[PDB]
Write a protein that binds this ligand. Structure first.
Ligand SMILES: O=C(O)c1cc(I)cc(I)c1O
Ligand SMILES: O=C(O)c1cc(I)cc(I)c1O
Lengths: 115, 115, 115, 115
């Protein structure tokens, strides 16, 4: 489990549940190729996206479908989605958590990268 | 104006207007003595809290009355207020902007300090 | 375990380890009485602060000693500490996670309150 | 100026100066067409990206080159950039401020939208 995505809701003070998340890897021609996807659980987490074998060094994009999340709650949002773009580097044994904290007109995102 | 407070609303995507702000300074006796107060304007900014003369070295607390803000809009938020505590002017006079970005169950705060 | 505190480091992209955390409850005379304290673990979490029996309705303050954290890393910080002040309400079965994401001149804090 | 970009540095407590910003607009063919670009000033602000005439309805992407910013300061950050994607001017012209608060492993972004 080298990659996990976590989403929190700053309006309700809760995990953001059933948020669609799409992960892409940058291809040689510079296009974004689908890599993994899922929906956050009751805990706002998405586990099992990839394996150590498949998660090679490269540039990844995590798209979080914030607009549909807010719409499902009957709340008017600003962004189309939240996008997190980063390079995975084999600087020893590392697990990546990409987290996002959501408001209708704002989001924060951080990386928690641990052994 | 050596001290300015700026407040934004992350739900509406707007300045946070009419937010009450109370500033305290730690006294010789180690208690929080009233220093200044005001409310944010239409721009979400609060200017004119103090002067270069009065804003001496000290430990300051800026209390931003976020609960009263959300309640005046008919919303029940999590926090009582947002308190920003910092040492000021310990290396001579600086200009401090204390900024806060508000959601019902979350806030962010930053400082912009200039010479 | 009705209360947990989590602290993350936005500079290193890691849990904030060995951060001192002090929790207070507001007393009848309006003073802050010590309630619980600890240091965050390797995961940046502080568990075991209180019990269901002791965590009655009231106003609580969570003080996170951010200044000492940054100093121990050799980094110059802005704030004395981060303070989170909130009312605990028995609106059915609820667990409170108070989380903070730290930078030298900024922090964010959110509440995750779940059944 | 209907579109402004503001960037702050959460490590230094300062405007983020000389940050490159590229704006794209989704074309009829569903690709990201170059729209405007510039760099933040000493105030951390980027004005004059566009005009009321040219800033028509559309889906816009504001790419803030955070990696280049941190690298120019001799720091190795997590993200490649911060991308802010939103529909603009769908209910007539508005003024948009897209703001970002940067740390090496984290960023926050908000919008301030006025009529
Ligand atoms: O706990 C988190 O995963 C978390 C994530 C973000 I992004 C911001 C805050 I405050 C948090 O507490
Ligand atoms: O524009 C601001 O003042 C601003 C203030 C905070 I606190 C966080 C973000 I993102 C901002 O953009």
């Amino acid at each position: 489990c080298p990659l996990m995505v976590k989403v929190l809701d700053a309006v309700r003070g809760s995990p953001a549940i059933n948020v669609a998340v799409h992960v892409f890897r940058k291809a040689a021609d510079d296009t974004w190729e689908p890599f993994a996807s899922g929906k956050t659980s009751e805990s706002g987490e998405l586990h099992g996206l990839t394996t150590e074998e498949e998660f090679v060094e490269g540039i990844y994009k995590v798209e979080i479908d914030t607009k549909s999340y807010w719409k499902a709650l009957g709340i008017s949002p600003f962004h189309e989605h939240a996008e997190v773009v980063f390079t995975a580097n084999d600087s020893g044994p590392r697990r990546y958590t990409i987290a996002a904290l959501l408001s209708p007109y704002s989001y924060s995102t951080t990386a928690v990268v641990t052994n």
